[PDB]
Amino acid sequence: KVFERCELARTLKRLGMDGYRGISLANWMCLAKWESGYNTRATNYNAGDRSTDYGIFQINSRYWCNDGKTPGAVNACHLSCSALLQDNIADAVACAKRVVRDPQGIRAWVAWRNRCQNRDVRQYVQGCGV
């Protein structure tokens, strides 16, 4: 489904995203905002390495989830890419946490550097009371 700004903020906080590995809820919101406009069904193909980004955090099926047709698939989240397109974002969140587990952090998503880094991300959570 398509979350409302503050609704997602409350949900992410509920799922332990606030401060996870130093990443503030504000930063996670800004990420979801530009990656999928808060849409759990958002999917994007990559006519390069032939992979696909799934869910609110646009997690790629090449190294994180298994869609069943991507070269060099590792599926570190040990999840089916379809599980990252449900109204309940528990699985997508856990796989997102897996992604930032690595040294690159949230900078793994180029959109963060371009749309969130050194920006007033507080606004994404402002007025939500989180």
Epitope: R14, L15, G16, Y20, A76, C77, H78, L79, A83, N88, A90, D91, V93, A94, C95, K97, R98, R101
Partner: nanobody, 121 residues
Framework: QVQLVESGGGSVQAGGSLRLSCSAS?????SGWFRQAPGKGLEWVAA????????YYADSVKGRFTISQDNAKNTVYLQMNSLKPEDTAMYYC?????????????????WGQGTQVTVSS
Amino acid sequence: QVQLVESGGGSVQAGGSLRLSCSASGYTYISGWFRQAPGKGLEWVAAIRSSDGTTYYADSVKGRFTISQDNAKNTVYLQMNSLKPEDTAMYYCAATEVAGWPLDIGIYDYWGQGTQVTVSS
């Protein structure tokens, strides 16, 4: 972060039963139970994915122990039925935040204090 508090350990006769509890102070994604004999290593026993309720068991305990979760109490349990002397060990519950293979100890970042389970012949 997240604290895990265990309880329910005990000393029983062979064939006995116990119910271990692992209460969390915050959100947990995957929860699991591990056992350890004195001076030996940690061994995976069981796990459950809180999102879909999928459970996983070690061959040695399948059919005898049941892992469950009461979301309203944010607590995970290990119901140990038909205990055997070989089950004697200190049991630890653990939780993960990241997604991964429930059988991989590497993804568990939070651990309970442990509780002793002793089964006599």
